[PDB]
């Protein structure tokens, strides 16, 4: 197994927030683009990164990849629900529950980035990341959309120094 | 708005 397996698993699990968010934004007619990359969130992210002793620019790059992957899922869901509205989730999303999950996923990702900073800067990162993704894609039974979104979300993991 | 960039933040409209 790869040492990035848990970091990638946390990222893949975090991508699934897209399903509740699209389900809510669909009914509420909210823009998918209004996703939170605002100065207050960027500063909080950087202050949380410095608190974990990891590079804020690196962490910001990771979450810039993550948000793009998340929006991409929401757009594909909107595409599916436009073609066949009946396939839309019947159940309302539990966003109070999702809020606490995201907080836990964020912390796990940041502590994992610190806990594996040496590997993320190493030449073996690329091979380790590829093995991690396949494990997570197999173990999480990720479909084509989530696989590609996981690739987008993790494409800067090995840009560490 | 409903945000997912860093925190899942939710303001009622």
Helix (H, G, I), strand (E, B) or coil at A121: coil
Residues A70/A15, Cβ–Cβ less than 8 Å = yes
Nearest residue to A67 via CA among A14, A26, A28: A14
Nearest by CB to residue B5, choosing from A37, A99, A103, is A37
**Separation between Cα atoms, residue A124 and residue A128, nearest integer Å:** 6
Nearest CA in chain A to B4: A35
B11 and chain A: CB distance < 8 Å anywhere? no
- The data reach a resolution, in angstroms, of 2.8
Cβ separation B9–A36 shorter than 8 A: yes
Residue A155 Cα distances to A26, A64, A107, angstroms:
28, 11, 20
Residues in chain B: 13
Domain ranges of chain A: 5-153
With CA atoms as reference, the chain B residue closest to A45 would be B6
Q: Which CATH architecture has domain A5-153?
A: Up-down Bundle (1.20)
């Amino acid at each position: 197994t790869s040492q990035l397996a848990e970091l990638v698993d946390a990222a893949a699990e975090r991508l699934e927030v897209a399903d509740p968010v699209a389900a809510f934004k669909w009914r509420a007619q909210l823009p998918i683009e209004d996703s939170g990359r605002v100065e207050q969130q960027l500063a909080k992210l950087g202050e949380d990164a410095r608190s974990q002793h990891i590079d804020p620019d690196y962490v910001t790059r990771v979450f810039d990849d993550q948000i793009r992957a998340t929006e991409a899922i929401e757009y594909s869901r909107f595409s599916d629900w436009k073609l066949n509205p009946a396939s839309a989730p019947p159940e309302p999303p539990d966003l109070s529950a999702s809020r606490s999950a995201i907080d836990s996923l964020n912390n796990r990702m940041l502590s994992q980035i610190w806990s594996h900073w040496s590997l993320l800067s190493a030449p073996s990162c690329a091979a380790q990341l590829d093995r991690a993704k396949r494990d997570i894609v197999r173990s999480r039974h990720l479909d084509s959309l989530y696989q590609r979104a996981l690739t987008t979300a993790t494409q800067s993991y090995c840009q560490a120094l | 708005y409903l945000w997912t960039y860093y925190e899942l933040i939710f303001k009622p409209c």
